[PDB]
Design a protein around this ligand. Structure first.
Ligand SMILES: N[C@@H](Cc1cccc(O)c1)C(=O)O
Ligand SMILES: N[C@@H](Cc1cccc(O)c1)C(=O)O
Ligand SMILES: N[C@@H](Cc1cccc(O)c1)C(=O)O
Lengths: 785, 266, 233, 157
């Protein structure tokens, strides 16, 4: 919200400076995003009187005859270029910022232009470059330098927040400061109003979309250009001046967060009617855009006879036709409080955002309409000659704000401060509030303009910001947390330890986007996403991931293309969506492998990652087996599921060839599972002292039977005094009964209280070689020291 | 067939010592209440280990700790600010000394816990050790009070034995504290009080010792108008009744069939 | 003394917006550019683990968790909740659609703003050295009053870092909590307590602390990038 | 005596006071993860070992050791490790092991030491022969531990 320093200094005369202001606002709650010095006007730029505009035969240019102290001529091709107005004459020589060239006395179409009059863009005061500036013909004495009436200005680009719509008025800001201790100068409505009827009427057909509506009658209007001060203040704040009346409505808008439109009576007819727009009704908004209203678009309409027509879109933009101009002589002035959600939806609806909509979407002073009238009318009387109707057309009667209970002791007890009572009360009063009672608990009723003030709290933050957030001491709480909060972090910790143990062991952590590409459920072969986006960033990011593993495979590819990693062992941990939101852990292998940099023999593939995982678990102290089971995305020959503590929790295996072939990737192993992994308690096993009994044999199994089944078997029956079972050699071929295999198994038995006899082991082994053969498995050897 | 139930590239699975575990557990517990953790040197100078801690010579108190005396030429033992210090070398009988080194090196208020190896000349059996770790905590600052000692030991009970665990405080003698006492925690599961450690409010003379050794180094007094409490407790005990380890001797036996059983723990 | 609890990334507009005093067609709603989800067959459980209804979305902040926790537990307590949050925005050098946050909320009898100011201070020290200082400026947030944005001074870089926002919990957020509370058979718990909460953006810090120039990097999953941090601690 | 808890802003110089103790743990952990088993050896040494393991004698001794074997204060962490290896091989027959201990060693100054010994068949496939072990195995393991710590690391003979 461009905040022109010189302007705001009119309500707050005692301001120290731009900088001190930025400092003061920031404390009040408003952070400035920038400060700018704006009106550098050279000396060559004098104020001139257009004595007579003459057209140039054959051209669309006019030869102006100016009174700039002395009589000079200037060629111009501007639609507003006319006699009777004052211009910004940049004499020959002047260097202008708006044309990066030196202004000279050049010859244009048979007439030599002694300089040139300028547009808001050529002078630099504004972006508009479609016509000269128009000032009162007597603004300054002919010739006097414009600078002498248009000093540079400093403008703070302020930040007003939803909670402070009153702050959308320079005088709203100006009141916040007044509470800081500054002096406030509110302008007065010098009105000479006369008793007489209003040549029109008001009919509010929609009291919901316009809870309070007023109109004021001003006639005798002498539409001309606004005085240099106003054009300046307007220009500085971001708006372009148009003429008396029009400007006076913008100014007051900005001055007090109260949008107001001046409707030329010529088009009002018998009256103004505030009502929803009839389906298809058309309207030519001020922006010269032809629109087609909608039934919900509250409108300002005039009616003649039995005809009802749209005069402008209520609290967003007026009609291009009712718009005040040169020949206007009377108007009907809109000054009302519209309904937030309506204006909101309407604006959105037509893709309009304006000073007016903006303030109505945020809110307006429920009882500000009448006073806003006086301000505006008084101005019109002074700047336009306006005669004014001592009365107004007011529809609606909002209720004053309600009293909020306020205990200073709470102000403090909440802030941790200790400002004395009297100091608190006065702060509120400075801000406008009315304070009743004598304590402890008081009755505070905010001013109508403070929509943010409802609770006691909002009221404590009122003391807070005016005393200074900085005047709030530091402290630290001490208390025994409540029981149920005890242990509350086991889960978050439990995860970290896992990420760490993983980060240690040798896995690189990754961070993939939660988003999925619906087309991937197909590529990577997966049941489609159960959740999607009504507004994705892109089609590729239109769904929510169901598996963590595809993001991994994709990075692998994305890496192989930027840098050529010869290997990689990643892992990611994130939330995956499907039926329920669940935390997932996964990481893919890949690359040459693990071995000697100068040697060939290497370790990699399935078993590398399969070993890595067995480690990670032995480390976590969790049981872990991996039984084969096909998976769409995995390889058929290389694929199985994960079993932590005897319960399935995910899969482990090599990617599927085709998926690789379709992705242009080499064999990429990987796995995925679901956390929180099984939690197993410690059953301390006081180790036996006595020596163990070593044992050996190789079970003869048919090529198909998975190592797992064999093992589980051997173990299952390997007596209760077994210590270790371990496969050291896996052979198959001659002379074995072809199509089979023998598994070298290292065993050890150990009794805790005493040593074991050969009879206890020789008999305890026959138990496992019997159930082994009773299953269909043989025996290569047995008992080998 | 391309089996998958088959064993993988036997990579080594790390682990951690029962004490590192039980020590960390304890550290984190106290870190959460604002205590920072600092270590001390195992070879101490009788000044810190005994005299700074108001334990004079040929004093009955000296008997509570059965000292290990060292003898060696060519050994530099640095103190607080890192300077050279003289005294009869020994292996610390507790961790308290560090409670003095810290206070000369820093200024109140603060909270610290110091874990560490301590030695005692004793006979190593099932529930006794010559080498065993401890944990000291010391919180000093204006206004500190015994209530705060009682509070922190409570918070340790909860954090360690559940909302149904409670702390008990009995008056006992310690030269470095007055009032002082031993404290026991109730272990609901085991259903019996565990004499955990000792503690109390720092002795006026321990501050005097600190501020004295302070000026002697050019540093200004810091503990003239503060108060503080400190406690110290034995690890191995806990770790034992918390991981169900029957014989204390195990911790140092360096046996694998033993240390592995804790790989999981957290 | 703050314990750490995580929340679910897919939230129900009730928690993410209504429990946090952010109504609909409200200007506040505009501070967060929401991501709306649509899916049949999705169970989203609430505090006590029950089934809950609401218009699904990806959380725009972590605050919601501040409500889930309070119905599931009773004061006093201190918690910090880290997590992934989403916003419909255009991803550039210093902006992201996916980025983590950290919320902290301390509630209990007697709590005060002084304590909020104290904890943010302790975060400054712990993070930028004894020569680092904190600054508090009043700002608007529907879930807090008083509220504000806070900046830390980074002596080395010699410039204030707008870190996050915070304030004292809004009376209505407690009402929402206690309300949703009775509706579950649980008795009111936050009638006579106070609390403060703050929330801050990770990626920002992590950036001016590991000297990472482009925020986009975090998710780019590039190795020549993630490796550069293997050491860090 | 009621219960309570203190609240105060610690004094500046106490700030950061734990970097060192932490720094060690992360290392013990990273090590415990990577694949090393932690050990706890007695601080005491046997004077006769300075001879056996070939080491300049102990600079500190005891005026009252528990036994002659425990009469000195260790100068190296590595002998305790080699000894456990033996002590293990005799009770249970570990076919391999990758230990590591971290403790205070005495000599001139008291200093914190990290060390661990390799040994065993090695690392490979339980049913296959091709294996990895010896020097380079442990040499690789260490390069990892460092790449992980983000520290340069070379080993000159
Ligand atoms: N768009 C109008 C301002 C306005 C304000 C309120 C209601 C309206 O219909 C119009 C203008 O151009 O001044
Ligand atoms: N140093 C005592 C334990 C103790 C008692 C009181 C306070 C402390 O800081 C420590 C011991 O080892 O017996
Ligand atoms: N939720 C806010 C940050 C914030 C502010 C105040 C209190 C909080 O708990 C959190 C945001 O994301 O912008």
């Amino acid at each position: 919200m461009r905040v022109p320093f010189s302007w705001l200094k009119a309500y707050v005369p005692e301001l120290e400076s731009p900088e001190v202001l930025e400092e003061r606002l920031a404390g009040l709650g408003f952070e400035t995003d920038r400060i700018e010095r704006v009106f550098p006007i050279p000396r060559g730029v004098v104020f001139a009187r257009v004595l007579e505009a003459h057209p140039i035969p054959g051209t669309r240019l006019k030869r102006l005859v100016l009174d700039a102290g002395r009589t000079v001529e200037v060629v111009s091709g501007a639609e507003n270029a006319r006699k009777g107005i004052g211009v910004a004459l940049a004499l020959p020589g002047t260097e202008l910022p708006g044309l990066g060239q030196k202004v000279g006395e050049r010859v244009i179409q048979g007439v030599r232009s002694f300089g040139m009059a300028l547009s808001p863009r050529e002078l630099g005061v504004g972006e508009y470059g479609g016509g000269l500036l128009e000032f009162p013909e007597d603004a300054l004495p002919p010739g006097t330098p414009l600078s002498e009436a248009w000093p540079e200005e400093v403008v703070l680009d302020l930040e007003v927040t939803p909670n402070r719509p009153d702050a959308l008025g320079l005088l709203g800001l100006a009141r916040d400061l007044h509470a800081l201790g500054y002096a406030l100068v509110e302008p007065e409505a010098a009105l000479k109003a006369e008793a007489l009827p209003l040549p029109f009427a008001l009919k509010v057909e929609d009291p919901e979309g316009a809870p309070h509506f007023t109109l004021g009658y001003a006639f005798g209007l002498r539409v001309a250009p606004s005085p240099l001060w106003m054009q300046r203040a307007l220009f500085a704040a971001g708006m372009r001046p148009i003429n008396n009346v029009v400007d006076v409505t913008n100014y007051v808008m900005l001055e007090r967060a109260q949008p107001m439109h001046a409707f030329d009576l010529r088009f009002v007819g018998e009256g103004i009617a505030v009502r929803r727009a009839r389906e298809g009704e058309r309207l030519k908004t001020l922006d010269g855009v032809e629109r087609t209203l909608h039934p919900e678009d509250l409108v300002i309409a005039g009616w003649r006879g039995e005809e009802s027509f749209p005069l402008g879109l209520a609290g967003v933009m007026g009609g291009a036709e009712s718009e005040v101009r040169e020949d206007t002589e009377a108007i009907a002035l809109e000054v009302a409080c519209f309904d937030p959600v309506s204006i909101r939806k309407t604006a959105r609806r037509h893709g309009l955002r304006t000073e007016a909509s903006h303030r109505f979407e945020r809110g307006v002073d429920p009882l500000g309409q009448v006073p806003a009238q006086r301000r505006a009318l008084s101005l019109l009387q002074a700047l336009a000659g306006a005669r004014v109707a001592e009365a107004l057309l007011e529809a609606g009667s909002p209720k004053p704000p309600e009293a909020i209970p306020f205990r200073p002791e709470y102000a403090n007890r909440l802030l941790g401060t200790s400002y004395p009572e009297a100091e608190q009360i006065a702060i509120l009063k400075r801000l406008g509030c009315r304070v009743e009672g004598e304590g402890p608990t008081y009755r505070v009723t905010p001013p109508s303009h403070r929509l943010d003030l409802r609770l006691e709290e909002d009221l404590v933050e009122e003391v807070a910001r005016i005393q200074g957030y900085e005047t709030i001491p530091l402290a630290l709480p001490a208390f025994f947390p409540a029981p149920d909060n005890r242990g509350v972090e086991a889960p978050y910790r439990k995860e970290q330890r896992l990420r760490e143990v993983l980060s240690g062991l040798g896995f690189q952590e990754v961070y993939t986007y939660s988003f999925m590409d619906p087309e991937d459920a197909r590529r990577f072969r997966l049941d489609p996403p159960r959740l999607l986006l009504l507004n994705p960033l892109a089609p590729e990011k239109a769904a929510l991931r169901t598996h963590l593993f595809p993001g991994l495979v994709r990075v692998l590819k994305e890496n192989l293309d930027l840098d050529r990693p010869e290997r990689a062992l990643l892992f990611e941990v994130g939330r995956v969506f499907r039926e329920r939101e669940e935390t997932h852990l996964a990481g893919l292998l890949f690359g040459e492998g693990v071995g000697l940099p100068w040697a060939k023999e290497r370790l990699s593939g399935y078993f590398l990652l399969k070993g890595y995982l067995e480690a990670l678990f032995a480390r976590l102290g969790l049981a872990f087996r991996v039984e084969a089971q096909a998976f769409p995305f995995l390889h058929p020959g290389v694929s199985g599921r994960v079993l932590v503590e005897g319960e399935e929790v995910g899969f482990l295996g090599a990617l599927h060839p085709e998926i690789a072939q379709e992705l242009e990737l080499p064999p990429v192993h990987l796995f995925e599972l679901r956390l929180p992994l099984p939690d197993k308690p410690l059953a301390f096993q006081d180790p036996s002292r006595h020596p163990a009994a070593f044992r050996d044999l190789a079970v003869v199994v048919p090529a198909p039977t998975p190592y797992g089944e064999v093992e589980a078997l051997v173990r299952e029956a390997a007596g209760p005094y077994l210590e270790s079972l371990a496969l050291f050699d896996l052979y198959q071929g001659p002379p074995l009964p072809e199509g089979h295999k023998s598994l070298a198994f290292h065993l050890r038995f150990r009794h805790p209280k005493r040593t074991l006899r050969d009879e206890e082991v020789e008999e305890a082994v026959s138990r496992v070689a019997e159930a082994l053969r009773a299953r269909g498995f043989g025996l290569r050897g047995l008992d080998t020291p | 067939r391309v089996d998958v139930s088959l064993p993988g590239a036997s990579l080594f699975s790390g682990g951690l010592h029962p004490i590192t575990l039980m020590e960390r557990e304890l550290v984190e517990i106290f870190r959460a209440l604002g205590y920072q953790a600092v270590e001390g040197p195992e070879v101490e100078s009788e000044f810190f280990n005994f005299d700074a801690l108001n334990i004079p010579e040929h004093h009955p108190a000296r008997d509570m700790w059965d000292t290990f005396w060292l003898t060696g030429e060519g050994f530099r033992l640095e103190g607080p600010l890192g300077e050279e210090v003289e005294g009869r070398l020994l292996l610390r009988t507790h961790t308290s000394p560090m409670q003095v080194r810290y206070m000369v090196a820093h200024t109140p208020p603060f909270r610290i816990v110091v874990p560490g190896r301590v030695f005692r000349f004793e006979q190593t059996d099932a529930t006794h050790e010559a080498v065993f770790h401890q944990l000291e905590g010391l919180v000093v600052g204006e206004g500190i009070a015994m209530a705060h000692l009682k509070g922190a030991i409570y918070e340790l009970a909860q954090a360690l034995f559940g909302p149904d665990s409670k702390v008990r405080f009995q008056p006992v003698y310690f030269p470095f504290v007055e009032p002082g006492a031993q404290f026991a925690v109730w272990w609901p599961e085991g259903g019996k009080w565990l004499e955990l450690g000792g503690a109390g409010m720092v002795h006026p003379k321990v501050f005097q010792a600190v501020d004295a050794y302070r000026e002697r180094l050019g540093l200004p007094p810091a503990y003239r108008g503060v108060t503080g409490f400190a406690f110290g407790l034995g690890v191995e005990r806990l770790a034992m009744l918390r991981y169900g380890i029957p014989d204390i001797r195990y911790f140092f036996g360096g046996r694998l069939k033993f240390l592995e059983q804790f790989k999981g723990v957290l």
